[PDB]
Amino acid sequence: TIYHAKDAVQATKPDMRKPRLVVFVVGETARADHVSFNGYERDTFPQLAKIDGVTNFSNVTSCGTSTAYSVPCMFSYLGADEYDVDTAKYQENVLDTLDRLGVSILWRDNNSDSKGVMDKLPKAQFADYKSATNNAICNTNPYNECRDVGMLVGLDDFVAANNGKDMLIMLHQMGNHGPAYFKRYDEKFAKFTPVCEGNELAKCEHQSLINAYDNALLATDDFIAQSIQWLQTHSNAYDVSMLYVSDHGESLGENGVYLHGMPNAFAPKEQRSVPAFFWTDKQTGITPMATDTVLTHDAITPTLLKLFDVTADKVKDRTAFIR
Numbered sequence: 106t107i108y109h110a111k112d113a114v115q116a117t118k119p120d121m122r123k124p125r126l127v128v129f130v131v132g133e134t135a136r137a138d139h140v141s142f143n144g145y146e147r148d149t150f151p152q153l154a155k156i157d158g159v160t161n162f163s164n165v166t167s168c169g170t171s172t173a174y175s176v177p178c179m180f181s182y183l184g185a186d187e188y189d190v191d192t193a194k195y196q197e198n199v200l201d202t203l204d205r206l207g208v209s210i211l212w213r214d215n216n217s218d219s220k221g222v223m224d225k226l227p228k229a230q231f232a233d234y235k236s237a238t239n240n241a242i243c244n245t246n247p248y249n250e251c252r253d254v255g256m257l258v259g260l261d262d263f264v265a266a267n268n269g270k271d272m273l274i275m276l277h278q279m280g281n282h283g284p285a286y287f288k289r290y291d292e293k294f295a296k297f298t299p300v301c302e303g304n305e306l307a308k309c310e311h312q313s314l315i316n317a318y319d320n321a322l323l324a325t326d327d328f329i330a331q332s333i334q335w336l337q338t339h340s341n342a343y344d345v346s347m348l349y350v351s352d353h354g355e356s357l358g359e360n361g362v363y364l365h366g367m368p369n370a371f372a373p374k375e376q377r378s379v380p381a382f383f384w385t386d387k388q389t390g391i392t393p394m395a396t397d398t399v400l401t402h403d404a405i406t407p408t409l410l411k412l413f414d415v416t417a418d419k420v421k422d423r424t425a426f427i428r
């Protein structure tokens with residue numbers, strides 16, 4: 106294990122002040138420019154629009170163009186310039202630090218796995234919500250595809266079992282995964298029709314392909330808002346905040362390019378400009394950076410430390426999503 110944060114101290118503790126409860130949604134395939142807040146032609150986020158104290162960040166570049174590449178980078182101390190995917194698995198990452206500091210770290214996954222981020226942590230601190238042995242909300246579509254809202258079912262137990270600790274809950278959603286965008290949302294979220302239902306994106310009508318993708322954003326909107334909504338039911342006991350960042354974006358036909366994963370060298374901006382949202386309770390004292398701050402995945406690790414009153418030298422100079 107290669108540490109970078111052995112100096113990390115937590116300056117105030119949950120026995121001498123309100124314990125902190127944060128949800129970090131790790132998003133999937135979402136594009137900054139199909140967010141309404143960023144100027145999109147469609148209301149892709151009606152519910153987030155209704156919630157007080159949410160910051161939309163109009164300028165976020167992802168560490169890379171794939172799940173296996175950006176998710177480790179998202180939790181790394183090295184930053185996108187010194188980051189190396191291939192040894193990432195055995196660096197100390199920010200969840201290692203907070204867990205060492207006694208913050209209770211949970212990872213629920215309706216996507217794949219943590220792409221190595223949870224590896225040094227006890228198996229039990231990770232749960233597979235793609236399967237119905239965990240996800241109560243799989244039966245809501247003709248595909249039986251388990252849903253991200255399911256990852257909220259039961260979080261109250263756990264908060265029960267961790268009563269009086271600091272908690273960082275990572276929800277790794279299926280989000281906007283392709284090719285089969287149409288499969289990602291329940292019929293309630295089918296605002297835009299007709300829709301691509303083919304596996305050969307390209308042979309589809311661009312508009313129909315745009316349409317499935319935006320329906321899949323509406324569901325993500327419903328998940329994120331339900332995520333804040335669950336936090337709110339704990340605001341008088343815990344300092345609650347919610348961080349959402351996508352791992353990468355998506356090419357939807359631009360220059361005959363689709364899906365993602367193109368090497369950062371020659372990658373279209375579509376695969377790298379990602380949305381980021383931050384919500385907090387007014388009682389917490391947290392303050393967001395300006396909406397328009399030019400930010401990258403490198404802001405996540407310092408945000409996570411600041412959320413828990415934890416300083417660490419390798420990122421004391423790093424711009425976070427919050428002051």
Ligand SMILES: [Au+]
Pocket residue numbers: 133134171172173352353
């Ligand atoms: Au991804």
